UniProtKB/Swiss-Prot annotation:
<comment type="subunit">
    <text>Binds constitutively to TP53BP1. Binds CDC27, which is itself a component of the anaphase promoting complex (APC). Binds PIAS1.</text>
</comment>
<comment type="function">
    <text>May be required for DNA interstrand cross-link repair. Also required for checkpoint mediated cell cycle arrest in early prophase in response to mitotic spindle poisons. Possesses beta-lactamase activity, catalyzing the hydrolysis of penicillin G and nitrocefin. Exhibits no activity towards other beta-lactam antibiotic classes including cephalosporins (cefotaxime) and carbapenems (imipenem).</text>
</comment>
<comment type="similarity">
    <text>Belongs to the DNA repair metallo-beta-lactamase (DRMBL) family.</text>
</comment>
<protein>
    <recommendedName>
        <fullName>DNA cross-link repair 1A protein</fullName>
    </recommendedName>
</protein>
Length: 341
């Protein structure tokens, strides 16, 4: 049945709640972002209003064939009225089109639902700063102190310099990057840019990227693999078998592959600096796991909450075991006592 952490009290609203059929009493279904665990259930046969960003609305229309009359896109940073309730969508610093939602309940309670986010100090100067938030529905993906990772900037720097060096030493080397969803476009776009190439990909992926309002995208991507030295493949194919096979498909244009797997966290991070990342190598194939995250580190999350000072926290991730729930509640209490709210 729809779980309680997907319902917004005192409204008729749910958030990311499309896999439970008709939710009794729901007048509006919000979708934070276009990732499958969140949209699971939508299709062309859905006949209730869906509230979302413009980018998420392009993907609903074009990839899932949801009918236009049921897509209600909202502008960011703008007070809107939905079924008599004031809402605002804020940028979540997750994947393209991903938002956080502020609800202003008629009784004066204010609720922020973060969707999936990577907390950043820039959020401390959005419309969030203008009033108090009483309840926080929080993306707790990495809510444990072992989860450290570098800035997105430092990771992209690593990747750019690695690729540029490899291709300049060997002009017959191909670069491959894995993907299974939207997000992390900076990885493959930044590499293509330094190498003076477009990124080549399947028609299904090209279609997905054309929904995203990326500036000058027609200048950066293509479906012509032959003219490109940066290829995107499904993440599943990012292994020695998958890449040897792909290399055979290129017809002796290339004699070496350098491949990137943007993973979230991997326990090499407890010890290893970004400077000290090494690849797995077999033959003329090398694979780099790089820690490009679009979720909050533990410290980033803690800082955001200690700034926001909410009265109640409701986790939305890692809620399925008692030991996870109990651990998170402990961190919440630590943060609250250290900061004094
Ligand atoms: Ni997500």
């Amino acid at each position: 049945t729809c779980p309680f952490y997907k319902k917004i009290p005192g409204t008729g609203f749910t958030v990311d709640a499309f896999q439970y059929g008709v939710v009794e009493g729901c007048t509006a279904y919000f979708l934070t972002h276009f990732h499958s665990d969140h949209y699971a259930g939508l299709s062309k046969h859905f006949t209730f209003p869906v509230y979302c960003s413009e980018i998420t609305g392009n993907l609903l229309k074009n990839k899932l064939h949801v009918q236009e009359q049921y897509i209600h896109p909202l502008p960011l940073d703008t007070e809107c009225i939905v079924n008599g309730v004031k809402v605002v969508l804020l940028d979540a610093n997750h994947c393209p089109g991903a938002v956080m939602i502020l609800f202003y309940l008629p009784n004066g309670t204010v609720i922020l639902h973060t969707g999936d986010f990577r907390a950043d100090p820039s959020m401390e100067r959005s419309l969030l700063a203008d009033q108090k938030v009483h309840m926080l529905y929080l993306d707790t993906t990495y809510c444990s102190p072992e989860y450290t990772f570098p800035s997105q900037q430092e990771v992209i720097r690593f990747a750019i310099n690695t690729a540029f060096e490899a291709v300049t030493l060997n002009p017959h080397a191909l670069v491959v990057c894995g993907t299974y969803s939207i997000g992390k476009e900076k990885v493959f776009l930044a590499i293509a840019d330094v190498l003076g190439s477009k990124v080549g990909m399947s028609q299904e992926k090209y279609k997905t990227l054309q929904c995203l309002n990326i500036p000058e995208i027609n200048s950066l991507i293509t479906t012509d693999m032959c003219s490109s030295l940066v290829h995107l493949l499904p993440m599943m194919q990012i292994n020695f078998k998958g890449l040897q096979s792909h290399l055979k498909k290129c017809g002796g244009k290339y004699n070496q592959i350098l491949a990137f797997r943007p993973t979230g966290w991997t326990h090499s991070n407890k010890f290893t600096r970004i400077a000290d990342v090494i690849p797995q190598t077999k033959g003329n194939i090398s694979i780099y796991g790089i820690p490009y995250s679009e979720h909050s580190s533990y410290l980033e999350m803690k800082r955001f909450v200690q700034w926001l000072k909410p009265q109640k926290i409701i986790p939305t991730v890692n809620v399925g075991t008692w030991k996870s729930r109990s651990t998170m509640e402990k961190y919440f209490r630590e943060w609250k006592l250290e900061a004094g709210y």
